[PDB]
Amino acid sequence: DDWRAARSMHEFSAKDIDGHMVNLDKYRGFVSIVTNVASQXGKTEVNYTQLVDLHARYAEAGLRILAFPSNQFGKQEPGSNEEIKEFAAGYNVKFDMFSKIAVNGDDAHPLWKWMKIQPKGKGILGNAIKWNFTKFLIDKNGAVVKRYGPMEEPLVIEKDLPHYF
Ligand SMILES: [Cl-]
Ligand SMILES: [Cl-]
Ligand SMILES: [Cl-]
DSSP, X not given: OGGGGOOOGXXXXXXXXXXXXXXXXXXXXXXXXXXXEOSSSTTHHHHHHHHHHHHHHHGGGTEEEEEEEOOTTTTOOOSOHHHHHHHHHHTTOOSEXXXXXXXXXXXXXXXXXXXXXXXXXXXXXXXXXXXXXXXXXXXXXXXXXXXXXXXXXXXXXXXXXXXXX
């Protein structure tokens, strides 16, 4: 379990929503938001629209967003990767969509196993992802800066970006 000894997001890779294997070292030098998404959650609309807004306002300063669909919370992402891709396109998403994953348990994607054990990656109750739309803010070196729970609208994160963004 090599993931445990990693010191950066940039040590990981993940399949994008089209099936292309992305080396997350592409995000070296960028501030990144990593979030678990779902299409059938009461907060789906507010999260997608606000992430799109953040991306529009800060991509040019170096903000990147990595969205990982997951069906682990109320079976609220039951669709295929192709269907999720078209769903996100209906919100005019131009940030990076990934293939559906698990975020908790032994079969969770290793990036998510890693984020949860970082010093600033624990939730208020504990490490497990609790619901759809948990967010992690990741610095230019790939370290976890802060975690935001399901109820935190993406605009909350804006206040924690570098002041010159
Ligand atoms: Cl993967
Ligand atoms: Cl981008
Ligand atoms: Cl929590």
